[PDB]
Paper text:
S-Adenosylmethionine lyase (SAMase) of bacteriophage T3 degrades the intracellular SAM pools of the host Escherichia coli cells, thereby inactivating a crucial metabolite involved in a plethora of cellular functions, including DNA methylation. Using single-particle cryoelectron microscopy (cryo-EM) and biochemical assays, we demonstrate that SAMase performs its function by not only degrading SAM but also by interacting with and efficiently inhibiting the host’s methionine S-adenosyltransferase (MAT), the enzyme that produces SAM. E. coli MAT is a dihedral homotetramer (comprised of dimers of dimers) that catalyzes the condensation of ATP and methionine to produce SAM. MAT is an essential enzyme and the only source of SAM in E. coli.
Specifically, SAMase triggers open-ended head-to-tail assembly of E. coli MAT into an unusual linear filamentous structure in which adjacent MAT tetramers are joined by two SAMase dimers. Specifically, each SAMase monomer forms an interaction with a MAT monomer and another SAMase monomer, so that each of the two MAT tetramers are joined in a head-to-tail fashion by two SAMase dimers. The interaction between the adjacent MAT molecules is weak, with an interface of only ∼170 Å. A SAMase monomer is an α/β protein composed of nine antiparallel β-strands forming a barrel-like structure and two helixes positioned outside the barrel. Two T3 SAMase monomers interact along ∼1,000-Å2 isologous interfaces to form a C2-dimer. The MAT-SAMase interface is smaller and occupies ∼600 to 700Å2. The “cracked egg” structure of SAMase dimer pushes one of the two joined MAT tetramers away from the plane. This bend between two adjacent MAT tetramers causes a propagation of right-handed helical twists along the entire SAMase-MAT heteropolymer. However, 6 out of the 21 interface-forming residues, Asp132, Val 133, Ile 178, Ile 211, Ala 214, and Trp 26, are present only in E. coli or in other closely related enteric bacteria. Collectively, DMD simulations together with normal mode analyses suggest that the entrapment of MAT tetramers within the SAMase-mediated filaments leads to an allosteric inhibition of MAT activity via dynamic coupling.
Numbering used by the authors:
A (entry chain F), C (entry chain B), D (entry chain C): 1 to 384
B (entry chain G): 1 to 383
E (entry chain J): 2 to 60, 64 to 153
F (entry chain L): 2 to 153
G (entry chain K): 2 to 59, 65 to 153
Write the structure that this text describes.
Amino acid sequence: AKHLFTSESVSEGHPDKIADQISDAVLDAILEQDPKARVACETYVKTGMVLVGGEITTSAWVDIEEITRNTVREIGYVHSDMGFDANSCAVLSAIGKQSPDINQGVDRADPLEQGAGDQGLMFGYATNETDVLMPAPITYAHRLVQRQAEVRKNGTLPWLRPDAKSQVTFQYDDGKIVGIDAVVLSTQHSEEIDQKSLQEAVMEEIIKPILPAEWLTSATKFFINPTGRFVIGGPMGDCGLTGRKIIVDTYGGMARHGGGAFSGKDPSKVDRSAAYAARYVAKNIVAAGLADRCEIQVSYAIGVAEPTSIMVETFGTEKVPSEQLTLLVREFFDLRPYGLIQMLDLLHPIYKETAAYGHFGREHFPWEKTDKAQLLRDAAGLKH
Amino acid sequence: AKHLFTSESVSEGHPDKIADQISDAVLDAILEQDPKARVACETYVKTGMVLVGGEITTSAWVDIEEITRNTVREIGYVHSDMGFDANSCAVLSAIGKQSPDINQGVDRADPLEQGAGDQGLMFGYATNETDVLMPAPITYAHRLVQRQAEVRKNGTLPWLRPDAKSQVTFQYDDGKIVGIDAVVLSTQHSEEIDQKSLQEAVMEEIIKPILPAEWLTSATKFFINPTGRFVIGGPMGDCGLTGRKIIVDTYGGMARHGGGAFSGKDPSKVDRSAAYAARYVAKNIVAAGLADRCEIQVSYAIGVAEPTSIMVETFGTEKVPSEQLTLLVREFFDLRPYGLIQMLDLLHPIYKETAAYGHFGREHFPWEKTDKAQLLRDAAGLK
Amino acid sequence: AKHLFTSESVSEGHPDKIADQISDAVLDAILEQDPKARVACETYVKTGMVLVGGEITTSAWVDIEEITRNTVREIGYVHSDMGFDANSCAVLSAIGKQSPDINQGVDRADPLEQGAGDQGLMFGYATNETDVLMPAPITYAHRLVQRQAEVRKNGTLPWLRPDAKSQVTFQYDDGKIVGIDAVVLSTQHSEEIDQKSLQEAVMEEIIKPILPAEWLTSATKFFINPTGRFVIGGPMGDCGLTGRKIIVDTYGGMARHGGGAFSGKDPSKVDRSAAYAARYVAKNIVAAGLADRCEIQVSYAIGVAEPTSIMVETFGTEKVPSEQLTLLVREFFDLRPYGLIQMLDLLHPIYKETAAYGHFGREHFPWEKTDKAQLLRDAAGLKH
Amino acid sequence: AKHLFTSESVSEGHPDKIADQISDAVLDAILEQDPKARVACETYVKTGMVLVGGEITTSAWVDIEEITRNTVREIGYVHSDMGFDANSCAVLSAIGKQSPDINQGVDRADPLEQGAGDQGLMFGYATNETDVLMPAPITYAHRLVQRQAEVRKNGTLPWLRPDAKSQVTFQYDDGKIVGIDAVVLSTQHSEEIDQKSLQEAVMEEIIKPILPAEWLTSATKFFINPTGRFVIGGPMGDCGLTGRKIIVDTYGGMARHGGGAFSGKDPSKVDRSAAYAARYVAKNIVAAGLADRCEIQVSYAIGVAEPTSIMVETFGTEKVPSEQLTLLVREFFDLRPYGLIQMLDLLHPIYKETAAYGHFGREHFPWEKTDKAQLLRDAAGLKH
Amino acid sequence: IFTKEPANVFYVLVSAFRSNLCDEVNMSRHRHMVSTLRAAPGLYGSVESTDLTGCYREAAPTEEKTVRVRCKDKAQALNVARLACNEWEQDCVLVYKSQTHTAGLVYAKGIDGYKAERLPGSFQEVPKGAPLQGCFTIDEFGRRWQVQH
Amino acid sequence: IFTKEPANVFYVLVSAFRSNLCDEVNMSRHRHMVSTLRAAPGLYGSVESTDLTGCYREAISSAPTEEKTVRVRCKDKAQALNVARLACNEWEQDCVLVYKSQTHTAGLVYAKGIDGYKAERLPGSFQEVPKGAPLQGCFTIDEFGRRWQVQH
Amino acid sequence: IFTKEPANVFYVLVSAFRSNLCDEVNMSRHRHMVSTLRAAPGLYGSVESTDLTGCYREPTEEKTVRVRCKDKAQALNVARLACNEWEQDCVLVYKSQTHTAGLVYAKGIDGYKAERLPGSFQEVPKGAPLQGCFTIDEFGRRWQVQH
């Protein structure tokens, strides 16, 4: 029957997402400079300071501080009142180690056979609830935050300030979405605005234009900056750790996630590669329509070319037996780490965009392409 | 149907869990010295550097440095050549401090009516699979790594060293464990021991104990330190960030999770407290037998006493109207933050034990206690 | 579920079955003389007159009355008191024989291309209830009357006379044979015998050895010549006609039936051969595990070799999609009449045995062969 | 859920139905003379001879010859070239009369209480697909053949001759009617008419006015005398029996059948009466709306007043538990033979009407009245 | 459900005449248009039956005297019917093939109003449970059009 | 589904205009009316795309017929919508289909005249054909069967 | 289920010593023999818990002993040959994690029998107690099979 479901998305003005943006900005830099790099970088966000630490394996030379300050500038933490400034803040670098020696030494084993980077497990989820196969609520929350940031940047609300968070609660009755139960929005605001103007403005420029008027109801409730005094935002407001905001990037708790932070890790790292892969394949699946939605779990042991475990789940939404389904999975896609790499060719510095507002749910991301579905189309016959 | 499932559990030796134990020990010490304080701290782990920082509205006064040193000591990283020596550990503290007494003297308002710290959603999952009312796989990997930890501490395999991970794959038939497809173990060790002797020894003193015989067959596939080189490990091995091992702390990914790390968070905040409360109600529900496996999504708004949204899910394993079930939940339980604080009395310095090896599935923990279940079953009706 | 289902069979001693036996014995001898012949013969049976008439094209030379009397003798009506005797009864051969067409048009050009002899429709049914792939009650009833005749022949109860009718009512829970509710057995008996001993000995020598003692309960009711007098049986009491008892021949009433009388019909005639092929493909589909209980309707427009319509019905027990199943049907079996002929080798002098006690469910019959089933088991490996 | 279904009918001009007509006309004659009689007459039909014989107990006095000649003449086989004559056909009555005194002598018995005259079993069906509560295809096919007979009689196409047969194939989606796939109509025709113009004429005067063009597609195929020559028609070309088209009499094979040839059976004969009762009660059931399509079966043990089995079948289209349903059934209806007699009042010379064009679906026949249905509906409280 | 009792492909359609709010003069108006159509059946090619009552719930059901007419010509006769409704301003009419008893309604104004609705689910049914639709009943037989779900 | 990719609260609605059997003069009529609609984008409040066609049994035995149609993206729940209605009224057009872009489903309004609102809401689905069965109210744009769906 | 707690590869098994013929003297010999078992921990190779009491409604109730032996069959062998010596034939065994196993009826030094179709064991569902009760720690427990 009817039951609430709730998902949230943070602004790209949030400290944790700030750290992720920083990390994958460094990643895009190093990657542009080298396709074959092996990088895992982490970013700590604190009031007066920002730190980056980790390891890089390549030939590239990279200025960390300017990457960081560019990033903050994009976000806009450029004045004391905000509690954080791109320029004056302290950047702390500990990554280095710049050791391309080990992998440059000898290269004769086939890449598709080169064992998994490190042990791990991950998931890829897909559905038909929306166009983009993502779950509805997480997508709506992403729309909310990105619209907020857009208003801040274009200047329609000059007094807006980068940090913000959003949470939405829908009534899932019989699977379909009848309407929103409630929406809660928190924003960083300049000191000038008073509360009432703020609530009015945000209900105006954000809530209505983004949400379906039908889902918008009187019974639906709206909580906007319940404290309302949020001129303090971002780091001085709260701590920031890379990948700490792990779920928001994903399906927003709609499905089970593996447990490896996307940002600050390169396609060499098995986590993102495999996760992109799982999302990609499940997307091709639901695009075929074999199941309204599918969950995919894949588990790698370190030094293993092949997935230790591959589980498919349709939640009964399957139109065909699940076993030949599994067969098709293992056939049509090479699940080897470098193999799915070649399948998706991630070696392009693009992740600075996927830094925030969902790592799936955007077309330009390559994994979101779903050609092979047609091949899948042929492999299975008619439903039932 | 039949399929495979996998989960993962880490040793205390892994850097992420290291930072987690660190921050949680901090929180337990401060809680001991002061119940009502507010705590938000994070820990970072570099090669020889450990960082701790956050806002702690407390009257308390304790050196974070010596606490960290003693904790790492207990972990045993007391030798640089391991990759980390507790004596040498570079300690960085930036912990924000503030006076909470002034705030509480200002508020003068009922606890229950006081709103949630921050907006956030969280889950609680339970099931009748385990008689500890957990999922099987994460529990097995937990017993695995902790048995390794124990057999190291007691020095039975002294050359063994702390850092270790376990990734385990079961075969589920029609939702029933028929056998373990594969078990993968990695562990830190001295250098002198051979890889093969190591695999043999660990299969003996780790694998055989925690794994039951029947699921083990020839078909079961074992992969132990496939690199074979895990002297190099620990912090120098890899940087550990507080909470990054969230899922493997929660449910092994058997069920959903919201994304708020447990460590460094007093019961006051919504994240950890609500997580406990959800697992608690779910466990009591299953103990009332209302559903065989159940997941709870509870969602709070910042500053708000009322929890924005409440959802129960039974995967059809319910025995009653799910809406009636929700009604019963709201009856028996005050989902307010202060409400669950009351119902579970989390105001006690205990979380150093929830540091590592499973937050849920250890009876001494308050939320794991299942009292209202019976009364819930009494509220239930037919069955 | 709780529902009681009944079927009913007859002995060979009953008039109608006598008619059919006569007709098909004629057919058997004739077709033996010439396989290529065409025969449509019907037999009326009255108090003492056996009438036989129909259309026959062949070059054969057969006495009607000879086979007639011999058949009646084999049945056993040899004495006045039975109410009938081949030595006594007068035989009326009304068959008009015209030449076989020797023209080259009906020749080699193509048997498969040769159009259907006559319009019509027929049914096949198969189930997974039994090893014989036929509904239970009809099978048990047939086995009952068979036990009866076998007694009357081996000499166990000589005072039995050939006419006998049996009827069984099974209980049904969840469509699983649970309990036999009622048993009605009327039989033809000599004058000397007495009613009570008859009831007893009949219950003993026939009912027990054929019904599973379990479904026999205390509450199980019995009716055995409840009229208490069946001295004068056979045709004298009542008219017997060709093929009228068509139900008992097919399915005992579990399945819907087309209406073509099988007895006394040459194989080239569409009805009998078509229905046999129907039962054939039904058995093959059921044996291939593709369904639990399947029904087949096939319809032929006179002069058109191609079946007008082919319906396959799985009652939800299809393990593969029903239409893909239908495709399978059209592919694996040629359904043109002469296609059936080649498929089954029907042009063989067999059916005299097939006159009575079940037109299906007796193995050595060609349509009953489950050979093709494996291929069908092959053509689809999906499980649901 | 897409399947082709097929049904089959014959004009009265067909020899078999002719035989049935003969029997029932005899029956109506006798019943007119005396209601209480017992009649079991059968009629064989050869090329030039019609044999009539049966067991009859009555005080009646009825020429078989006059009746037969009248009936045949009314049908129209009044000429040699037709293939059969009413005036020169040979009439043979094998009728053996029993004494009505055995009927008068039995007394002091509840007429109701008396056991059934003869064991049996039968299925009456009903479906709300059509307002006659009959399977659509067989009803349309009756309308077809009847229209043909009508155009023969009214003189519009006098070259048309009585014998004619019909075969229709409908599409079915979701169990629902969509289109007619195929239609086959073959008739006897006078020599003067051609093939082609006959095709045209049958297309117009019969097919068009009777078939809903919506069901008629260009893709829908047509067959009219596919052999292209049917001058020799009637019994001359092909033998005919009494009760050898038991299917088209009842349901066109949509529903499983008991197997009692109705014609020539007196009401007191259990088969005809009981089957009437079955269709009657099933029609009342569906009319009350207690279910959408119900098949009733009833079985009777010889010498018993109470049936052995009364099984209702709803195909899930029930609106109430089949068990409460069965209780209701045995509540309102007394399936005692004389009971169903008094319920239906069969004691009237009316069956010459039910000769052809289906025993069911025709209003004035009392068993089609649906008054009981209201008290049925009100018996169980149903609100949907 | 396929009635199959009335004639085959012969068409049947209904009309109201009571479109505007002129209750009594509306009644006479209807009657006069009835006289018009019935007086010249040939052009209409139709058999009239004026007893019926047409109830449009239209969110407060309005009931207007209505007439069902059987039109033989697959378009021509019903076309004449459409014309009549047009001149008498009657907005739109229902048509259906009796055997199938299913057809959408056609709107028809101007010279040749050829505007027949899509979604032609069904018609001539009485579920007797939910009256929240157009009451179109003759001899207390509420004949409502439906769709499939 | 919830087609998030398309624009938000906008209503996308279709129009046919080819009402009477006027085979090619009706097509010219169509082109004319499309031009007229494009002529006043403001009050029409819509962008037009003319690829779509619509296909019905039409309950008049002759044959299912199809008409060229146009999709227009009105921003106004009513204003540009009402303009579309008044247009089809002018063009003797009986009914129109409007579905709200984000939900991707909303019922039809067979309102005409000057100031009439006949707001039906179908069973809440639209533009959704998996190429299974084309029986229903027939649509195609960009060779996509895209028609509403009734609940089951 | 699976009880998750006890050492895995360990073998916990329940046995009754009292026959049906008498009760109190069967109970005396019960405590005697079970104490003999208890006293020797090497052959019986197990720990004992005497709380458990069984019923077989077939409620024939008797005092029972739960012994946990490491040896997969060996101390189990001592237990089963011991029940042989006490003429008792009914003895249940189960492995901790599975928390079930079939039933063994093994007298004779090598006479060794194995059950067929074991589903589960040592849980009561509170629904239908027709099965053999096994009540310990104020909790009933029975064995099971899939349906």
